[PDB]
Every structure is written in C-alpha cells, then in structure tokens.
Design a protein around this ligand. Structure first.
Ligand SMILES: *[C@@H]1O[C@H](CO)[C@@H](O[C@@H]2O[C@H](CO)[C@@H](O[C@@H]3O[C@H](CO)[C@@H](O)[C@H](O)[C@@H]3O)[C@H](O)[C@H]2NC(C)=O)[C@H](O)[C@H]1NC(C)=O
Ligand SMILES: *[C@@H]1O[C@H](CO)[C@@H](O)[C@H](O)[C@H]1NC(C)=O
Ligand SMILES: *[C@@H]1O[C@H](CO)[C@@H](O)[C@H](O)[C@H]1NC(C)=O
Ligand SMILES: *[C@@H]1O[C@H](CO)[C@@H](O)[C@H](O)[C@H]1NC(C)=O
Ligand SMILES: *[C@@H]1O[C@H](CO)[C@@H](O)[C@H](O)[C@H]1NC(C)=O
Ligand SMILES: *[C@@H]1O[C@H](CO)[C@@H](O)[C@H](O)[C@H]1NC(C)=O
Ligand SMILES: [Ca+2]
Ligand SMILES: [Ca+2]
Ligand SMILES: [Ca+2]
Lengths: 199, 159, 378, 431, 126
C-alpha cells in the first residue's frame, strides 16, 4: 500500500549509510533521518521484496536495522526515526564501506535482488584513512553492489564522489548543497534506484 | 592397628609395607598423605642430602616445622617445645621430639640420631600416597609416582 | 531520571539557578554535562574507543558502534583456554583436542596435543598444534614444542612464504603462522597459542574455542548440540582419540596437593591486583587471570617461570586493548635480551631483520611488540 | 584377520590412509580425523563406526548430554524445551523460557542472561526496568538495600516495585502496598513456604525469600526490553554490564554505580582485593572454616544437582557473605546462600534435603497449633509446592516457580488450607 | 535475671563467641544461652527463648516415619526429667528436674521406647 504515490515492490536489498560526523548538525541529522524514513516509507519493506538496513558510521558502524531483520515496517520506521545523533569529529567512508562489504554483504543468500549502498557523505575523511577506499569500492563492485554516493553538504568530500562512479557503470552521484535538497530530489532518487530494478 | 614408615639411617627409607631404599634429596618430599582428599601432609625436609626437619601441613593453612636439633617453627616464627595447638601436640615423649596428630591420625618422632617416624592409622589403608609408599599390604607396589605410573627406580619415584 | 521517587518534602536550601543541572559539585549547563565511563568524566563529543568499536559521548549517553571485533582463543598456561567469546575456563585433559575448526566452510582444523607438563596431576599444557589448512592442498603444519615448524613431517626453515602461509619468527621466539589475513596463530613453543581470527568466521567455528558469535553461554557447545553444564563434559566431547581417559572432576585448587607453595602463590599472583596494574584493571578484570596465575604457580614444575607466564599473559591481555603496563624488573621477571639485543619496551618489528632491508617493498602494518629489538642504526 | 568383515592396513604410498589410529567412533566420527601416520591397522566398513565394543550402525549411535549415552529416539528436558537424539544430534525445540534475575546473597547478583557478578552497594539501585529507551516503560523494580556495604548481619534489603499504578514496597519480611496498582485484576500475593511469591502482572513475577534473595521472573514479552542490574535479557551474556549510559562497563562496580537512583547518595569504592574479604585473608581461622563449611554445595546431597547446575558461583557467594558477615546466633548469612543454591537446584526438578538438626536448622513447630494441642498442622518440606489452592486463592493461579521449600501445611482434600488463622479448615469456612 | 545474675554468662558469651568463628554451625553462641536457660530452669524459672530465627531447634526428623507422620516428637523448652520408658520403667532420681530438648508427648498409655524412638504399648518391650 503506497503511502502517497510510490511503491517499488520488487526484489531488492538496500542499505543506508547515514553519516555521523559533526558536519551535519543536530537539525541536519534529523533532516537526514526524515529523508531515510520518508524514503523507506515508499518501498515494499519485507524480506520477500525489499531489505532495508541503516548503518550510522561515526568512525565505526552503528547498524540499527539489519537487512536480515524481519519486523513490522512501522517498527522499522520507528527505529530509523530513533537513530541517535553521534556527532563525531570525523567519519570514515572507508570504514563503513569495509563494514558493509565484509559483515553486511559477504554471505550472499538472495541473488534475486540487487545490492545498493547509499553513502550519504557529509565530511572529508582524512587522507590517512583512505588507503583502501578504491580497494573496497572494487570489492563491492565484484559482489554485484552499486554505490550511490550523495554529497550532502558543501564539505562532503567530492573527490571520492565521481571516483566511486568512475569505478562502476551504475554508480551515480547525487551531489547536493544542503539537506533541504534531499526532499526535492527524493522522487528522483527513488526513481533512479527503481530503474536498476531486480524485479 | 597402624602402619609405620621411618626415614632411618643416613638417607634411608622404609615404606609402610616394608620396602626400603636409599634417597638423599633436597626438596622436602611428601612422606605421607592421601592423594585424593589430602587434608594434611607430612613433609620430610632435606638439606644437602641430610635429613633436616620434618614438616607437617594441615590443609593449606597450618604449617609446623620440627627440625632435628629440637627447634620448632610455625613457618615464620619460633615456638617453645610442648606447644599444644589445633591438634598436633608437639611434645617430648621419651627424649624424642614427638609430634602427635590424633584427629587425623599419625605420630611423628625424631630421635637423637634424627631417624624420623610415622604411624598412620588404618583408615588410610590403600589411601596414603606419599613418599612412604601406599599403605597396602602389597609391599612390591610402593613406588607409585605422583604421575600415577608405578616405577622401579627408587630415585624417580622419590623425585 | 527516576521520577515519582522525589516525594518526601521541600527543604530550604541552595540550588542551580534555573536550568543548570547540578554536576558533581557545580551547577553546569544542561548540555555541558559529561558522560561517565569507568569513573571518568568526558565532555560531550568525546570519542572513547573500544577494541574495534568506537563510542561517542552524546548528551549523557554513549553512542557505541556495534561491529564485530576479531576473535582470540588464547590457550596460555596449564589449560587456561579463553574462547573467542571471552569465556575464561580451564580443562586439564590429556589428549588431542580440536581447538577450533570452521565447521561451515572447512578451511582450518587447528588441533592441540596436550600432555602432563609436570609432576602435579593438575598440570596439563599443550605441547604441539596441527594446523590443517585444506586450502593449500592438505598441508599439516606442526608448530611443535619449542617453536619447531614442520610441514607434512618435513621440517621448514623459517621464514616460510608459501601461497598464503607466512610462518615467520616473531620478535620474541614465537612463530606467527599467518594466512590470508584471516588467521594469525602465534605459538611460542610452550603454552601460548593465541589464535587471532577475523570476523568473517563469526558464529562459524567449533571445538574448544566454541562459537564466535559473541555469547558466552553457547561457548560450551558440544558437536552434539546441547551445551554442557560442566567443563569436563564439554572438553571430553571435543576429544580426538577414542582411548584417552575422559577427564573427571576437573580440579580447581592444585595448591592443596602442594601446601608448601601456598604462601608464594598468594603473595606472588597479587601484583595483578596491585596498583602496578590498576591502569589495566578497568581495561580488563584480572579475576580470571589471577585465578589462572594461582593455579599455575602452585601446580607446575618451576613456580617462578609459571608466575612469569601468567603475569605476562595478563600483561598481553591488557596491551591488546590499549593500556601498556611496565611489569618488568628483578622480583618480577625480565626478558634479559641476548648480547646486542636490547629490551626497549614497545619497539618496532619492521625496521630490523635485514631480510626487510633486502625487501623494502614490504609494508610495516604492525604495532609494538615489547621484545628484543636491536639498538638504533643496527 | 578378524571376521566377518575384511581387514585392510595401508596403501603404503606416502602414509595417507587411516589405520587403526583413526577409528571413527560416533562421538569422533563427526570430528575431524587424527594426526598420526598410517599405522597399518583394521577399521570398520566405510559407512560404519566402531562405537563401544565394535562396529555399530552410523545412524543409530547414541547421543550424549551429561556424558550419559542416549539411544536414538530418546529425549531430554532441558529447561522448557525438549530435544531428541537424531543422527547423533539433539533436535531441540525453541521456546525461550522464563528468565530469573536472583539477588544471591547480600552483594552478588545474577542477570537474566546468566552473568553473575559482585556489587556491594549501600544506595538504591534498579534491579529490573522497562524505561530503557524508546520503548515506553511499564514497570520498574528497585532493590534499595540498607546498611549492606559489606555483607553484614544488620543488612536488610528494601525492594520497591513501581508497577504500572503504585509502589508495592517489600521492606523487612512483609509486603506493604504504598499505592494500589490501578489494574488490580492481576495482582496476587501468594505466601508459600519461606517465600512471598508475587504475580505482579501477566508475565513479570517477583519471588522473595523474605530476607535477602529477590528473584524476578519474566517471559518472552520482556526479551531485550529490560535493563538495570539484571541486564537486557537478550540471551547474549556479554552485553549484560551495559551501564545506564549505554556502555559495557568492564568492572561490575562501575556498571552498578550507573544504576544508582540517587545521584548524590554514594559511589561504592573499587576495592582492590579480589576474594577473602574483611576477616578472610587475615584470619586463617576464619577463611579455613569458611571454605570447609561452604563446601556442602559439593556434598553428596548436592552431587546429583552439581552436574545440572554449576555450584562455583554459589561457592564464591558462600565464601563471600560469610567472611564479611560476622555470624552470631542469626547464622543466616550462610544458610541463605545454601538455600538459594538449593532453590536453584529445585527449579531443575532436583529437590535436595540438606537442613539438619545441626547444619542450618529450621523448625516449623511454632506454627503447629501451638495455641493448644499443637497438632501437626504444619511441616517443613524441601519441595513444598509453592502456589497451592487455598481459601484466599481457591483458583489455580499460575505461578513462576514450581515447588519451593519452607513450612507447608499438608492437609487432606477435606478442610483445605485457610489463610488468616494459618490452619486448614472446612472449605465452607473460607469467605 | 533477678534470681541469678547473668554477668558470668554475659562474659562467657562475649568470650567464646568472638573466639568462635561460627559458620553455619551456630552452636558456639547458642550453647551459652542454652546453658544460662538451663541454670534458670534449675531455679524453676523456665524460659522459652528459642525462636525460628534465634538458634532454631527442630524436631521434625523424629516424627518422620514410614507410616507418614507421627506428630509426637516436639521441642519442649523445659520438658520433664527422666521419663519412665520401656527400657527404664522404674523411676530414677535425676540430678536435674527439668531439661530442654526434644521429647515425645505420648498419650497416657503406650509409654516411650528407646530403639525406634516411638511410643508403643508396654507389651511390645521388655
Ligand atoms: C636447628 O636447625 C635449624 C635449621 O638450620 C636452625 O635454624 C637456623 O638458625 C640460624 C640461627 O640464627 C638462622 O641463622 C639466621 O638466619 C637469618 C635468616 O636467614 C639471618 O638473617 C641471620 O643473620 C642468621 O644467619 C638460620 O636462618 C636458621 N635456618 C632456618 C630457620 O632454616 C636452628 O637454629 C637449629 N637449632 C639451633 C638450636 O641452633
Ligand atoms: C586401589 O584403588 C583402586 C581404584 O580406586 C582399586 O581398584 C583397588 O582395588 C585399590 N586397592 C586396594 C588394595 O584396595
Ligand atoms: C625504525 O622504524 C622507524 C619507524 O618509523 C623508521 O622510521 C626507521 O627508519 C627504522 N630504523 C631505525 C634505525 O630507526
Ligand atoms: C526437526 O524435526 C522436523 C520434523 O521432523 C524437521 O522438519 C526438521 O528438519 C528438524 N530439524 C533439525 C535441525 O533436525
Ligand atoms: C513435600 O510435599 C509433597 C507433596 O505435598 C510430598 O510428595 C513430599 O513427600 C513432601 N516432602 C517432604 C514432606 O519432605
Ligand atoms: C513441657 O512439658 C510440661 C510437662 O510435661 C508441660 O507442662 C509443658 O506445657 C510443656 N511445654 C510445652 C511448650 O509443650
Ligand atoms: Ca604399598
Ligand atoms: Ca570462541
Ligand atoms: Ca545481554
């Protein structure tokens, strides 16, 4: 039952990567949570069709909902709205990428659906921590994973953006200037994700 | 009834069943005491091969040292001779320093020559597992090492 | 925030002005109140970090990452196992036991050979291991007593750099059997068999190390399902031979059999609780380690050597989680490095072993080791 | 060599085959083979295992739970689940049973998942709770002690139960309802044996020893939905030391201090010593007789239960609470620990009779009609079924325990047990 | 107390109780109080001081019998002196007129036996 207009009721595996850095203020992080909730609201949330997982990284993954979890979509909405604001001084795109590659998506058990990761970067990971970034991106590529980078804030590292796209055919970047643009581009983003529909 | 084992002579031994041998150790070997529920242990202290002191330990708390020259200690302090205590009435019986424990059952003597002695009670029949050999009528199996392997070399079993 | 309890009476006394929440002794601002961990105050936004997960002090709360940390199945001392899920326990059985095996996808079958290592009946330690990596054909590595590597019976001159194996001497006479960045067995030839193991094996191993999911309760699982209440049954279930005696009544107080050692055992395995290790106490509770030290010193051939082993085991446990205590001096134990070598607590392994100079292309992703490194420029 | 099956030794190529050394017994058949050389020995057929004397059917080899061997088709009753020996494996059911968080002794706690730890406290703490996070709270139990820094004779625990409506404070040895819970439909105070078993709600239930042991029983509902000194009841045992501010505290003291309700009361100090507290470690006398006396847990009467439940935590609780607790006359700091272990054993259907005329005596004659005649209306019973039909509770209300020791009024079917006069009288005599 | 001063027994209890490390077996303290109670009883001042939480004394095991429960063996704070029983039919001049402890309050007939600790008809004994 689509809430307003959309229901991407197809086999899909989806993971979110809500950034936990201090760059996104408390209000900005709340807007991001609203984005993720309103996003999953328009998907057929169930292990049969759509698997959703939110993974806040604040220099360490903080998965609140796992793609293997099976609960009422209302409960998942509540949990997503309840993601705490870490407010860390430095996030780590590479660390969350490794987490999803090894501990979230390393035990393929449902090829019917596809693997999509929404990296909502809002801060620049220090170069010293970018040693294995390309390696993990390529590894996810091998695992049939499409990374959709989202350059939320002006400080969002853009070099990594379009570099994730460079090492993949379907990796699309949604570079935004503020969280407000998320509400504007919500429909476009859901549409794009449903173009790569596993049916 | 009661068995008897004595560390007589100079570095000699006589198990509870008659088997005897010679052993001049240095590490205060366990003369007697059950190997399942120890609850006490007579220890024959040794110095440079000579029989120096006969110690008794109750469980893990009470330590008493008798020595061959008549001196006594609690483990860290000296004490007078009669020294009645929790069991272990350490006295002079007939010129020999007698250490008697009846609640557990044994009597340790050290005569002038320094020949130790022990009189374990029957209730340790086949139960004692010290250097004085298990208290079974069979005297040929009194080299039961702590490892549980019956050896024939007296020094292996003693060590 | 336990409301409904403040139901006694008013009292005419001082207070915070309007909004400041009374801190320990100050009326600090509501937002500025710090989180507390291990009796320490940390301003909001602090990034206190655990082994692999990091926590951040939000408003009066810690937002803690919930990743999986690498496992460890240390088997130091006289049968002093510690399952991947920290499950400090002792099992003195003399036979070949399956330390850990990847039951789901067979990729290693580490096995320990245990034998009585002293006169006391309560003195059993592993003397050998039988790493059985089936990926590399069927090599049976045999990291024997005394740090002696042996592949398929044939001895091997370390370092070995086969397909995935990287069996190479560590800083202090301990062969480090690496693998495809998933196994990091360390074996010093006497006891220690620290088995690092990456999270990819979470909840996929068996044997004495039990599962790796992260719950201690399941760690006593036999291959038959039901977990064992007593340690003896659990250990027996993982026995290789059909002939070795099944352990009965795993003894807990070896010091009773040797009353003479009680004084030394009590007064020696107490530095663990002494202020010298108070820095680590919070990092790791020395309850299992103190018990292990007492069981070792009063149960083995050489009391002082086993005291060294136990205290060093606890020090290594602390070091693996940050804090690095001193614990090295006469009265304690000392490394007494050979001529030329020096102690230099927390050195670096890479820049020595001229083999490294020959191969500068190699990397240096290794931390401090506290070994016998060479002096600078050598 | 030995009929009726053929005998083989080795191929003698590179010592690869499995000889007599690697005999596949069912307990070992699943386990990987040995690590030895080809010993040129015989073995059972390929799909055959040499269990007990000789070859035995591979699919018919018994399973083992407590060492003992169960033939295929047998079953065991572990907790509330059940398992059957199938293919040398236990096919267990899956029903997460009730979880109990006992307050063993005067300073030790046992969490729902299983963890036991030491936390000597003087202030008021949170035993179990539902006001954990986002989930709205429904109940809250406080176990505020009083004069119990170290286990002491003058130690009384004041439980405060903040169920939906009102407090049910359990101070002293009685039950006081400071406020009445709005929904009085499900609230029973069953007084049986030595306990005041309650039925706070549909699922939660608190069983009280009336002196110092307080156990809280939950059901599937509260799984992962509780917090406090009893952990989160998530099954996982490692994460049961999560402080109030969510973080797994390494030492139990700093974990417990987080649940101190009164921020100003006091922070229990981190004692450096590990065991042998107070008098112990400085008395020899005391420590020796404490360890000797606190060993009935391993005595013959407990031998049968020693395997079902490990007595080591209760051994530690008995060692503790006895060195510090100077026992004079009211020698209960030790009997209470032994009784707690006996109760835990009984929960596994292994009732044990341990009290004697000397060791922890306990008499019930005072209540046996001592007004006149003192006929045997009351008896001491190790089991004593807890929740029994009576005048106050004629209906068979559900109970969190099965059978609890203490005084028990054994009465024939006629003249069921009454409530006020503590005498079993004609059924019509009830209200 | 007004008939026999307790100070000697107060000292005997303060002593012999601190010295005793009473663990589980609580007789060190209880025995002194029982001795003072016995002395009091000698002066015809019987005192029922035992309780369920102060040095409890039980008698259940006696009544425990194959026939179910006898309900005859009960603790009497004073009880009488030597009671005529099957093995001791004739009366005796006991030094103490009253002695606490367990005793069977058997009905008027079937005086107590010794071996089976149960009171039965006089015929079933010598
Ligand atoms: C009976 O034999 C025992 C065992 O040899 C004698 O004990 C020894 O007594 C001497 C006398 O002083 C002790 O010497 C002192 O030792 C202390 C501590 O080592 C040292 O600081 C002093 O400077 C002095 O050397 C000796 O330690 C002690 N040995 C023990 C107790 O093992 C005992 O004296 C003999 N009986 C008589 C009456 O001499
Ligand atoms: C010694 O003990 C063993 C095992 O407990 C027993 O089989 C044997 O009969 C005992 N020996 C004697 C002489 O009783
Ligand atoms: C030792 O290791 C350090 C690590 O930074 C390196 O810089 C140095 O070149 C190495 N060699 C010496 C002699 O210090
Ligand atoms: C348990 O038994 C059922 C019914 O026989 C069967 O379908 C299921 O596969 C069994 N599970 C296991 C783990 O043996
Ligand atoms: C306790 O009561 C039950 C049933 O009332 C009975 O079967 C059992 O024998 C009793 N145990 C005693 C009296 O020790
Ligand atoms: C004790 O016995 C005496 C005489 O038999 C009796 O008068 C008294 O009431 C008894 N006391 C109790 C408590 O039964
Ligand atoms: Ca013999
Ligand atoms: Ca493990
Ligand atoms: Ca838990």
């Amino acid at each position: 039952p689509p809430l307003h207009d959309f229901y991407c009721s197809r086999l899909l595996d989806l993971v979110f990567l809500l950034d936990g850095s201090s760059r996104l203020s408390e209000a900005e992080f709340e807007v991001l949570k609203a984005f993720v909730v309103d996003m999953m609201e328009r998907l057929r949330i169930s292990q049969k069709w759509v698997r959703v997982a939110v993974v806040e990284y604040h220099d360490g993954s903080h998965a609140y909902i796992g793609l293997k979890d099976r609960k009422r979509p209302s409960e998942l909405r509540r949990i997503a709205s309840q993601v705490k604001y870490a407010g860390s001084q430095v996030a780590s795109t590479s660390e969350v990428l490794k987490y999803t590659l090894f501990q979230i998506f390393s035990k393929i058990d449902r090829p019917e659906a596809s693997r999509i990761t929404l990296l909502l970067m809002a801060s620049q990971e220090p170069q010293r921590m970018s040693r294995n970034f390309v390696r993990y991106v390529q590894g996810l590529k091998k695992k049939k994973v499409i990374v959709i980078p989202v350059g939320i804030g002006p400080h969002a590292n853009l070099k990594q953006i379009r570099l994730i796209e460079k090492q993949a055919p379907e990796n699309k970047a949604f570079v935004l200037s503020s969280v407000d643009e998320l509400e504007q581009q919500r429909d476009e983003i859901v549409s794009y994700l449903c173009d790569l529909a596993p049916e | 009834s009661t068995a008897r084992c004595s560390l007589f002579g100079s570095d000699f031994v006589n198990t509870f069943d008659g088997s005897m041998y010679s052993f001049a150790g240095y590490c205060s070997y366990l003369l007697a005491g059950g190997c399942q529920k120890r609850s006490f242990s007579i220890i024959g202290d040794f110095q440079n091969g000579k029989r120096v002191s006969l110690s008794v330990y109750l469980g893990e708390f009470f330590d008493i040292h008798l020595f061959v020259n008549g001196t006594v200690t609690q483990g860290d302090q000296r004490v007078s001779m009669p020294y009645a205590s929790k069991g272990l009435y350490l006295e002079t019986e007939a010129g020999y320093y007698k250490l008697s424990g009846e609640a557990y059952g044994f009597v340790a003597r050290i005569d002038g020559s320094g020949n130790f002695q022990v009189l374990l009670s029957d209730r340790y029949f086949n139960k004692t597992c010290g250097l004085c050999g298990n208290f079974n009528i069979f005297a040929e199996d009194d080299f039961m090492t702590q490892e549980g392997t019956l050896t024939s070399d007296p020094y292996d079993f003693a060590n | 925030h336990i409301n409904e309890m403040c139901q006694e009476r008013c009292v005419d006394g001082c207070s915070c002005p309007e909004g400041q929440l009374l801190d320990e002794g100050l009326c600090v601002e509501s937002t500025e109140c710090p989180c507390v961990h291990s009796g320490k105050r940390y301003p909001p936004g602090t990034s206190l970090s655990r082994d692999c997960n990091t926590c951040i002090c939000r408003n009066s709360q810690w937002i803690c990452s919930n990743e999986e940390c690498p496992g460890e199945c240390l088997v130091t001392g006289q049968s002093h196992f510690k399952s991947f899920d920290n499950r400090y326990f002792t099992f003195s059985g003399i036979c070949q036991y399956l330390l850990a095996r990847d039951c789901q996808d067979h990729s290693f079958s580490i096995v320990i050979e245990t034998v009585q290592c002293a006169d006391d009946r309560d003195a059993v330690c592993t003397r050998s291991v039988t790493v059985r990596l089936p990926g590399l054909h069927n090599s049976l590595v045999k990291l024997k007593h005394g740090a002696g590597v042996a592949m398929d019976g044939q001895d091997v001159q370390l370092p070995l750099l086969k397909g995935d194996l990287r069996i190479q001497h560590t800083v202090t006479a301990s062969v480090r059997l690496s693998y495809g960045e998933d196994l990091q067995m360390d074996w010093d030839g006497r006891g220690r068999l620290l088995v690092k193991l990456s999270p990819v094996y979470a909840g996929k191993t068996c044997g004495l190390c039990g599962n790796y999911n992260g719950n201690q309760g399941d760690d006593f699982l036999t291959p038959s399902g039901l977990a064992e209440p007593r340690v003896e049954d659990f250990g027996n279930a993982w026995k290789l031979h059909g002939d070795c005696q099944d352990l009965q009544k795993q003894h807990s107080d070896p010091c009773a059999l040797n009353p003479r050692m009680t004084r030394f055992s009590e007064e020696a395995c107490a530095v663990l609780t002494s202020p010298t290790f108070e820095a680590c106490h919070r990092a790791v509770s020395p309850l299992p380690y103190l018990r292990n030290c007492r069981y070792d010193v009063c149960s083995c051939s050489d009391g002082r050597e086993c005291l060294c082993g136990a205290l060093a085991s606890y020090a290594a446990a602390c070091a693996g989680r940050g804090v690095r205590v001193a614990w090295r001096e006469p009265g304690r134990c000392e490394l007494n490095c050979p001529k030329g070598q020096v102690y230099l607590q927390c050195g670096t392994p890479c820049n020595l072993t001229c083999r490294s100079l020959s191969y500068p292309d190699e990397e240096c992703n290794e931390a401090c080791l506290e070994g016998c490194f060479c002096p600078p420029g050598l | 060599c030995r009929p009726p099956m053929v005998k083989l030794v080795c191929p003698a190529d590179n010592l690869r085959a499995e000889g007599l050394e690697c005999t596949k017994t069912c307990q070992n058949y699943d386990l990987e083979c040995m690590s030895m050389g080809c010993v040129s020995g015989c073995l059972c057929p390929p799909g055959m295992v040499r269990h007990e004397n000789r070859c035995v059917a591979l699919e018919r080899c018994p399973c083992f739970h407590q060492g003992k061997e169960y033939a295929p088709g047998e079953t065991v009753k572990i907790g509330c689940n059940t398992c059957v020996c199938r293919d040398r494996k236990w096919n267990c059911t899956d029903h997460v049973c009730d979880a109990t968080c006992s307050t063993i002794g005067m300073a030790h706690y046992l969490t729902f998942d299983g963890l036991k730890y030491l936390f000597p406290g003087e202030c008021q703490y949170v035993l179990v709770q539902d006001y954990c996070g986002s989930n709205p709270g429904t109940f809250r139990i406080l176990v505020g002690n009083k004069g119990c820094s170290h286990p002491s004779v003058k130690c009384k625990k004041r439980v405060t139960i903040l169920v939906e409506g009102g407090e049910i404070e359990l101070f002293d040895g009685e039950v006081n309802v400071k406020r009445p819970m709005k929904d009085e439909t499900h609230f029973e105070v069953v007084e049986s044996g030595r306990y005041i078993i309650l039925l706070l709600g549909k699922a939660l239930s608190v069983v009280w020893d009336r002196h110092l042991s307080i156990s809280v029983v939950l059901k599937q509902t509260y799984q992962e939905k509780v917090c406090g000194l009893c952990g989160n009841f998530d099954g996982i045992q490692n994460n049961d030391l999560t402080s109030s501010n969510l973080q797994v505290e390494e030492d139990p003291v700093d974990f417990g201090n987080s649940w101190k309700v009164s921020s100003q009361c006091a922070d229990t100090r981190k004692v450096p010593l590990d065991s042998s507290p107070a008098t112990c470690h400085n008395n020899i006398m005391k420590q020796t007789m404490v360890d000797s006396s606190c060993r009935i847990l391993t005595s013959d009467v407990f031998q049968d239960c020693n395997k079902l439940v490990d007595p080591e935590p209760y051994l530690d609780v008995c060692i503790y609470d006895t060195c510090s607790c100077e026992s004079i006359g009211d020698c209960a700091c030790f009997c209470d620990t032994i009784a707690a272990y006996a109760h835990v054993c009984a929960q596994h259907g292994k009732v044990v009779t341990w009290r004697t005329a000397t060791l922890c005596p306990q008499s019930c004659e005072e209540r046996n009609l001592r007004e006149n005649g003192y006929e045997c209306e009351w008896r001491y019973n190790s089991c004593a079924p807890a929740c029994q039909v009576t005048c106050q509770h004629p209906e068979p209300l559900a109970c969190p325990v099965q059978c609890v020791e203490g005084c028990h009024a054994h009465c024939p079917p006629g003249k069921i047990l009454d409530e006020l006069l503590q005498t079993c009288v004609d059924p019509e005599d009830c209200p």
